[PDB]
Amino acid sequence: GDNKPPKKGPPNGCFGHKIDRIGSHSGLGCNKVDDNKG
C-alpha cells in the first residue's frame, strides 16, 4: 500500500473490489467475477 491508496472503508471485508488494474504491492478484488476462480 502507501503508494496505492485503496478505496474508503468498504462494507466489512478485505481490500476493495478488483476495479483497479494491476498492482504489485496492493491487490484489490474482494468480490468474484463471472469467470474461473478458486
From Swiss-Prot:
Changing P10A: Important decrease of antiplatelet activity. Changing P11A: Important decrease of antiplatelet activity. Its main location: secreted. Keywords: Disulfide bond, Hemostasis impairing toxin, Hypotensive agent, Platelet aggregation inhibiting toxin, Secreted, Toxin. PROSITE patterns: NATRIURETIC_PEPTIDE. Residues 1-38 are annotated as: Disordered. One of its GO terms (biological process) is regulation of blood pressure. Pfam families: ANP. It comes from the Eukaryota. Expressed by the venom gland. Changing K7A: Little decrease of antiplatelet activity. Changing K8A: 10-fold increase of antiplatelet activity. InterPro entries: Natr_peptide (IPR000663), Natr_peptide_CS (IPR030480), Natriuretic_peptide_brain (IPR002408). Changing K4A: 10-fold increase of antiplatelet activity. Changing G9A: Important decrease of antiplatelet activity. GO terms for cellular component: extracellular region. One of its GO terms (molecular function) is hormone activity. Changing P5A: Important decrease of antiplatelet activity. It is found in: Secreted. Disulfide bonds join C14-C30. Belongs to the natriuretic peptide family. Mutagenesis was carried out on lebetin-1-gamma. This is Lebetin-2-alpha. The lineage of its organism: Eukaryota, Metazoa, Chordata, Craniata, Vertebrata.
